[PDB]
Design a protein around this ligand. Structure first.
Ligand SMILES: Nc1ncnc2c1ncn2[C@@H]1O[C@H](COP(=O)(O)OP(=O)(O)OP(=O)(O)O)[C@@H](O)[C@H]1O
Ligand SMILES: [Mg+2]
Ligand SMILES: [Zn+2]
Lengths: 286, 50, 48, 50, 287, 50, 101, 94, 209, 53
């Protein structure tokens, strides 16, 4: 039972460099390491990590290597220098995840019972995706269905404590997405807030294209869980009509007479204060 | 605003009382909760400070 | 310099007052012998 | 049982120790005026849910 | 064959390891190592930092554990990258940055073993707001007492980055050690992933905060803006020749006529437009 | 049109040995600084009795 | 004993000494303790020591006692409602007590 | 059947389809509201039943096709009038 | 960069400030302040604070390290901390007293009425009365009437008993008298009820003690 | 290994003080001989029942 995980920004950061460490010999396109944590409540916390040697073969995709002995000693080091921290799970990248992750997880659940895994996305870093985290439960699958593993999802976020925002704010220094925004800042939030609306929708576009067209076997769970979405959107009516112009006008009145008039009179005050001070220095030059 | 914010980021000055102190570029200051100090002057002021 | 309240047996665990700063439970440094560190004596004390 | 006592001390070793003070008044919904037992006055806040 | 105005490159991953580990043990002057590569004569880079277990002595040569040294180095050889140590650091909470008398002895140990072995001093409790009090130093000989200490040469980037501060030149600056400049090996794909992932909001960009507190806040500003308009009436109908360039300067108070004016008009404008414009779009987008 | 000092004299007792007296010396030098001066006493049935 | 709470015992003769502003200070504290623990029973034996009666001149000692009395007299019926607190006064003398008491 | 365009169902349609009498449809719909397969409401000045419904089921792949066409009309309305906003306020967006 | 500057100026003050007291002002934007750590200082002051709140004296807010003036506290924000507001307040009402028909009206003229209908006094030019003495045999509704005024007043009410401001140290008592009347003058139209004052009221001719 | 770890962090010199009172919500209020009163929620390498003011 996990509410959400809290990503401290040293861990992802300490994944990207380790991807860049092996990148000079880079032929693996995945990096697996150990995720240290600090379990507090139903909300989880992560603030440290390290890596571990791992390999994987494209053929048969089930021959894989977590190193236990390397995981024993180096965690024994980080325990010795800081006894606050313990393991909570592991990480990898390459968002098209290999199906071997059942075997990786079920091994190292003997280190943490409620083990958890976080996928970072080093190269896809563009539209709307910070990270992603899964949780491991196993039902059979459903009522009259065979057995399965079925990774489940817990929502994620990026956390912030003091003396890392100090490291953050000193490192941005360029545009920073400055504090509480202007008119231009809010409109861009509406732009790329909406540019991801169809982006999530173009993904759910392609799913019920390729499942309803007739390629891959249908889930049943996702279908009716999509159905109630379409029977929940609001429509226009007379009660929506007279109400909207009741309070659009009420928002409008504050703009119209109180903001446009008074800003004009202030600029009109700057007329007379300029023109008096202009010509009284003009007529008194000589 | 930059000139203010830099001079804000500065450890403030002490205050010490001198009714009289000796000459030759060094004076004798007891400050507030402490003893006496033989200090040096800055070069924008005089030895005629007494 | 300080004073010594008392001592212990087989191991120093000496009790010493600056008395203007606090009273401390300290050790002797390696340059001395534990004989002449008797009670009520002026001793040389490290700053750190 | 002996390992239980050792792990209690590993918990016990990491505490910080605190400062005793008393509240003089409340200024705003987050600004307080407290005073230490032997020292100065301050302006403080709460943790989350105090 | 002597020193110059050099340059120290620290990685972004180093700096977060520095001032988190310093903030962790805020009373007790934490200690760690500095792991990089001497790239040429007068630039140096460091890519990685790991900490040290803390002894009862504190920051000295004895807190350097040689068996923790070689074992930590060994398990970084096969994972990540092996490289040479290039220095060390410690934390000075109660004051900004200067090498103490025990700091100067452990610097002698490393500069005898290594090439230059740059030290780093970090104050975590002073480094709070938007600036970091971090500085790096290097021990200078006494053999050049008849010659120029800080042997610098043909460059004009010495007068930048700091004048030697008064709280640091009261200690062994500039006759025991010298300062050295710091800039950051800062790159794309780490800059953008720290920008876009720490401050982001996707579905929040078209929410409403709807109207029970929004239209309430439309009352919350207008009311004192009425009274401040009556105060704006007062100064303008006053308009007396009381030497009016002196009359304007002897009553600066961050007050009525323009300062406490249209600032409110801006906030009333930005709040209501972004509210009503997002309201019309949700009618457009959702059916 | 002169420097005018109001002292309701009961405010020179404060709590301490010393301090209640030394400000009287520190009063008249503050009146000597603004050298034309008038100092006023309220209710000498207090300090000044017998 | 019957449905007890923080019962107090005051001998009412240890609460006088040399310095003038202390006998009122004890009485203020003992009532603040009673407002702290809401069921409470005050017991003060031998009220006649500090109960007394007010009169013209007793110059040295008696003015302290009357000011001690008026603090007691008007913090059990003060501006604050003494709530959930009961007081048992016991003295063997009383012929002369304050009629306000 | 009707996709909430006019989900205000008349009572006679229940009395026709379920072939139950008029007086039993209220106990019939309060039952299904009690079980929790629907979250509508009942008016009786018109005797019409309002329907806000949350119990979904299988929708038989030929009706995934009509579900696709709803999603595409929904798709192009998002994209088109996003472009109208970006082109209108391009000079102050930056 | 102008918005970066106003932010960094803004977030220098939301911090655990230390509190000292303002002592003297040299000139524009620099002054002398003494801390409540002892050890009087000399620091720069801001450009935010209107300088008419630094008269000779104010409790002020100070940064830890840079030690500069940061903010001016509200006047006498503590002193003796005596504001009877909303538990504790009266547990009584005005009509609860039976039969003091002349006397409820007479207190009402001096206390309740000039707070509301102040213009009636200005219409005649009276200078409405300032103090009131109540006296009688004990148990005749004196403290009860004072509770009823504290119900239906809209003023800052301060209760005093006439014994806690004579106390241990020398000169300590009259400083508490100073603490009350500064606190009332700093506050709104206010009411000070000093309960029985014949402790400190008897006229002395001379004391050989 | 834990006893070796406690050995290093339990190190002379010591401040002396006097326990003023003891609480549990195990808790202690301590005035040092620097004339400074501190609080600690966790006591340390003794037992609370073995202590006295
Ligand atoms: N007119 C009245 N109506 C109702 N109750 C009254 C009246 N007069 C007196 N009392 C009762 O007498 C009690 C004493 O009231 P109060 O304390 O005001 O008298 P007092 O004269 O102030 O006594 P003291 O002067 O000794 O303080 C009150 O609790 C009240 O219940
Ligand atoms: Mg009374
Ligand atoms: Zn050091």
């Amino acid at each position: 039972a996990v509410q959400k995980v809290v990503v401290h920004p040293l861990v992802l950061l300490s994944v990207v460099d380790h991807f860049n460490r092996i990148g000079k010999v880079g032929n693996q396109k995945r990096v697996v390491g150990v995720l240290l944590g600090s379990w507090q409540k139903k909300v989880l916390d992560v603030s440290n990590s390290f890596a571990v040697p791992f390999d994987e073969d494209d053929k048969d995709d089930s021959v894989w290597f977590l190193d236990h002995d390397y995981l024993e000693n180096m965690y024994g080091m980080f325990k010795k220098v800081n006894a606050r921290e313990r393991i909570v799970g592991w990480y990898h990248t390459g968002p098209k995840l290999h199906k071997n992750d059942i075997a990786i997880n079920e091994l190292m659940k003997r280190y943490c019972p409620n083990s958890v895994l976080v996928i970072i996305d080093v190269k896809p870093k563009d539209l709307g995706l910070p990270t992603e985290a899964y949780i491991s439960v196993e039902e059979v699958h459903d009522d009259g269905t065979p057995t399965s593993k079925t990774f489940e999802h817990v929502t994620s976020e990026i956390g912030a404590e003091e003396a890392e925002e100090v490291g953050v704010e000193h490192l941005l220094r360029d545009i920073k997405d400055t504090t509480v925004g202007t008119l231009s800042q809010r409109i861009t939030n509406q732009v790329h807030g909406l540019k991801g609306l169809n982006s999530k929708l173009l993904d759910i576009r392609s799913y019920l294209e390729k499942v309803a067209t007739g390629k891959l076997p249908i889930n049943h769970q996702i279908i009716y869980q999509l159905q109630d979405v379409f029977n929940l959107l609001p429509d226009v009516s007379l009660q929506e009509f007279v109400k909207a112009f009741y309070l659009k006008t009420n928002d409008q009145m504050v703009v119209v007479y109180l903001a446009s008039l008074i800003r004009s009179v202030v600029a009109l005050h700057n007329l007379i204060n300029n023109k008096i001070a202009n010509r009284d220095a003009e007529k008194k030059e000589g | 605003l930059r000139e203010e914010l830099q001079l804000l980021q500065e450890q403030g000055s002490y205050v010490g009382e001198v009714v009289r102190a000796m000459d030759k570029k060094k004076v004798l200051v007891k400050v507030h909760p402490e003893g006496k100090f033989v200090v040096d002057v800055d070069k924008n002021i005089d030895i005629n400070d007494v | 310099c300080t004073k010594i309240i008392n001592a212990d047996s087989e191991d120093p665990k000496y009790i010493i007052n600056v008395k203007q700063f606090a009273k401390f439970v300290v050790d002797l440094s390696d340059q001395v012998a534990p004989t002449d560190i008797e009670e009520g004596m002026r001793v040389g004390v490290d700053r750190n | 049982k002996q390992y239980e006592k050792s792990e209690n001390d590993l918990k016990a070793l990491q505490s910080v120790g605190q400062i005793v003070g008393e509240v003089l008044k409340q200024l705003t919904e987050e600004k307080f005026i407290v005073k230490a037992t032997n020292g100065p006055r301050y302006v403080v806040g709460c943790r989350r849910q105090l | 064959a002597v020193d110059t105005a050099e340059q120290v490159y620290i990685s972004s991953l180093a700096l977060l390891k520095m001032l988190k580990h310093g903030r962790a043990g805020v009373p007790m002057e934490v200690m760690g190592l500095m792991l990089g590569e001497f790239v040429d004569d007068y630039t140096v880079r460091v890519i990685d930092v790991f900490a040290m277990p803390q002894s009862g002595t504190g920051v000295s040569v004895e807190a350097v554990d040689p068996v923790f040294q070689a074992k930590m180095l060994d398990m970084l050889k096969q994972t990540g990258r092996p490289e040479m140590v290039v220095g060390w650091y410690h934390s000075h909470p109660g004051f900004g940055c200067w090498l103490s008398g025990v700091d100067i002895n452990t610097q002698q140990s490393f500069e005898a073993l290594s090439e230059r072995a740059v030290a780093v001093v970090v104050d975590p409790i002073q480094s709070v707001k938007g600036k970091v009090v971090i500085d790096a130093f290097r021990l200078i000989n006494a053999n050049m007492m008849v010659l120029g200490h800080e042997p610098r040469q043909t460059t004009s980037n010495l007068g930048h980055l700091n004048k030697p501060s008064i709280q640091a030149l009261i200690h062994g600056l500039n006759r025991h050690y010298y300062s050295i400049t710091i800039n950051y090996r800062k790159n794309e794909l780490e800059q953008k992933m720290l920008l876009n992932l720490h401050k982001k909001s996707w579905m929040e960009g078209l929410t409403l905060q709807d109207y029970s507190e929004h239209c309430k806040h439309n009352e919350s500003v207008v009311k004192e803006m009425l009274e401040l308009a009556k105060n704006y009436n007062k100064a303008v109908e006053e308009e007396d020749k009381m030497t009016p360039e002196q009359l304007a300067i002897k009553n600066v108070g961050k007050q009525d006529p323009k300062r406490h004016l249209e600032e409110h008009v801006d906030v009333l404008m930005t709040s209501n437009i972004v509210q009503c414009l997002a309201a019309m779009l949700d009618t457009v987008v959702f059916k | 049109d002169c420097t005018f000092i109001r002292v309701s004299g009961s405010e020179l007792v404060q709590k301490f040995i010393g301090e209640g007296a030394r400000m009287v010396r520190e009063l008249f030098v503050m009146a000597r600084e603004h050298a034309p001066s008038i100092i006023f006493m309220d209710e000498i049935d207090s300090i000044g009795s017998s | 004993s019957q449905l007890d709470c923080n019962f107090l015992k005051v001998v009412s003769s240890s609460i006088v000494d040399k310095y003038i502003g202390e006998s009122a200070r004890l009485i203020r504290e003992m009532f603040n303790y009673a407002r702290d623990h809401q069921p409470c029973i005050i017991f003060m034996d031998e009220i006649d020591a500090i109960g007394g009666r007010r009169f013209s001149e007793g110059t040295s000692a008696d003015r302290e006692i009357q000011r001690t009395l008026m603090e007691l007299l008007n913090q059990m019926d003060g501006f604050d409602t003494l709530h959930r607190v009961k007081m048992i006064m016991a003295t063997n003398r009383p012929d002369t007590l304050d009629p306000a008491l | 059947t009707r996709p909430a365009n006019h989900r205000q169902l008349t009572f006679e349609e229940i009395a026709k389809s379920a072939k139950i009498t008029v007086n039993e449809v209220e106990l019939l719909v309060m039952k299904a509201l009690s079980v929790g397969l629907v979250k509508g409401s009942i008016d009786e000045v018109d005797k019409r039943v309002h329907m806000t419904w949350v119990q979904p089921r299988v929708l038989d792949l030929q009706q995934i096709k009509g579900m696709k066409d709803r999603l595409e009309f929904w798709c192009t309305d998002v994209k088109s009038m996003e472009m109208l906003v970006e082109h209108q306020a391009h000079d102050i967006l930056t | 960069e102008f918005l970066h500057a106003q932010e960094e100026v803004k977030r220098i003050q939301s911090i655990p400030l230390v509190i000292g007291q303002f002592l003297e002002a040299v000139d524009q934007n620099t002054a002398i302040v003494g801390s409540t750590t002892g050890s009087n200082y000399y620091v720069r002051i801001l450009s935010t604070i209107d300088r008419e709140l630094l008269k000779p004296n104010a409790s002020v807010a100070l940064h830890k390290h840079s030690n500069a003036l940061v903010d001016v506290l509200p006047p006498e924000a503590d002193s003796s901390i005596m504001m009877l507001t909303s538990d504790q307040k009266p547990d009584v009402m005005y009509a609860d007293i039976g039969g003091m028909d002349i006397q409820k009206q007479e207190v009402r003229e001096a206390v309740e009425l000039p707070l509301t209908h102040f213009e009636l006094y200005k219409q005649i030019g009276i200078d409405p009365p300032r103090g009131v003495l109540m006296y009688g045999p004990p148990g005749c509704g004196k403290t009860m009437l004072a509770k009823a005024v504290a119900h239906h007043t809209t003023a800052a009410f301060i209760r005093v008993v006439g014994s806690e401001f004579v106390q241990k140290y020398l000169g300590e008592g009259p400083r508490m008298v100073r603490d009350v009347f500064r606190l009332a003058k700093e506050n709104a139209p206010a009411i000070i009820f000093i309960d029985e004052i014949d402790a400190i009221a008897t006229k002395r001719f001379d004391a050989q003690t | 290994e834990n006893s070796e770890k406690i050995k290093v962090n339990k190190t002379l010199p010591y401040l002396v003080s006097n326990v003023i009172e003891l609480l549990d919500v195990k808790c202690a209020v301590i005035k040092t001989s620097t004339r400074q009163t501190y609080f600690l929620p966790v006591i340390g390498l003794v037992d609370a029942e073995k202590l006295k003011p």
